[PDB]
């Protein structure tokens, strides 16, 4: 009866790293919420 609105399943297709996931870019990960990557614990 009510107007259809997007749900979690619909919204999760816009939450990937890129659109149209492929074999090569399947292992890509979206950037961190704040654009600060974790510090690589480089041995000194």
């Amino acid at each position: 009866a009510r107007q259809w609105q997007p749900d979690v399943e619909w919204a999760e297709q816009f939450g990937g790293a890129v659109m149209y996931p492929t074999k090569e870019t399947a292992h890509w990960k979206p950037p961190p919420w704040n654009d600060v990557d974790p510090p690589k614990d480089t041995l000194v």
């Binding site: 609105q5 749900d7 979690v8 919204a11 919420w33 704040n34």
Partner: protein, 320 residues
């Protein structure tokens, strides 16, 4: 002049208002401990500003009128229902946990803003650095899932890294049987349903994780139930501390300016709380979101800006 780059270029510096008595203090303890009264005594003895522990409706007290709003419009969670049915399938437990974490983050931002604007010290009854113990208490008892823990960890990692830890961490250690007896003597029926395992998990996470973590960057003053009543002893113990291990001595005017710009603009503070992570416990549908937002807009002093609401007595609107 509202604080900003212009107020920093000319005049206003904050290192000239820090007077060595600021000493941001958080008083910490298990459930039903005398930490609140000790915090109040410390605040009124040291001349600091006391912050009552942030509850569900803390944000309602700092916006509009201080009166709290409806639970459906703010919070959407209750502690009584968590005590009654901690394993309810509606996701009340983690929703309450996340709302409480956001409230604590807001309170920490307000305390830091007051400290950096007036120089007066603050006392807190808890902080975002110690909220996680409750989260762990829910995880070990099966109240919440592991995905909720991961979401909490992500939000905490992206939020708490931008602030400074408190100078002094005060812990009131009360054993589990004693707090159980205090809860029995309290009189609230809902609190009587707290199992001993919950309090034991809180104490375990509190002793094994929080205190060791804060030892490397804060002054930790553990106490006991009997030592808490004599607050003069605690105060004079605080007056003879050496705040030399934390990141506070390494703060310049530029870092303080950045932090002061961050603590105001509460929208920036709360930005990363609502990240697009779709947990069923905290995700709200479009229809319910629209209905609740429309209801919130209908509140007497919430439709417009805090100076343009005619129906709460604001006059001269057309000339503003």
């Amino acid at each position: 002049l509202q604080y900003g780059p212009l107020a920093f270029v000319l005049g206003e510096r904050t290192t000239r208002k820090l007077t060595e008595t600021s000493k941001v203090i958080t008083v910490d303890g298990n459930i039903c401990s005398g930490k609140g009264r000790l915090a109040r005594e410390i605040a009124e003895k040291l001349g600091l500003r006391h912050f009552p522990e942030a509850g569900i409706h803390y944000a309602d007290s700092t916006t509009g009128d201080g009166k709290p709003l409806d639970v459906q419009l703010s919070g959407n969670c209750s502690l009584e229902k968590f005590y009654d049915d901690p394993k309810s399938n509606d996701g009340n437990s983690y929703r309450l946990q996340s709302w409480l974490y956001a409230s604590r983050l807001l309170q920490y931002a307000d305390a830091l803003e007051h400290l950096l604007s007036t120089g007066q010290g603050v006392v807190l009854e808890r902080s975002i650095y110690s909220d996680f113990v409750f989260l762990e208490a829910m995880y070990r008892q099966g109240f919440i899932r592991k995905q909720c823990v991961e979401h909490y960890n992500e939000v905490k990692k992206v939020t708490a890294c931008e602030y400074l830890p408190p100078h002094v961490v005060v812990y009131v250690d009360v054993p589990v049987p004693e707090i159980q007896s205090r809860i029995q003597k309290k009189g609230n029926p809902h609190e009587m349903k707290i199992t001993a395992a919950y309090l034991q998990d809180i104490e375990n996470a509190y002793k094994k994780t929080f205190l060791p973590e804060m030892s490397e960057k804060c002054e930790v003053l553990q106490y006991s139930a009997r030592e808490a009543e004599d607050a003069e002893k605690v105060v004079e113990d605080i007056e003879y501390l050496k705040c030399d291990k934390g990141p506070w001595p390494d703060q310049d005017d530029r870092t303080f300016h950045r932090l002061r710009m961050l603590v105001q603009n509460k929208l920036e503070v709360l930005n990363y709380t609502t990240i697009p992570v779709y947990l069923p416990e905290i995700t709200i549908g479009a229809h319910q979101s629209d209905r609740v937002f429309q209801k919130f807009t209908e509140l007497p002093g919430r439709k417009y800006s805090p100076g343009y609401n005619e129906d709460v007595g604001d006059k001269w609107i057309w000339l503003k």
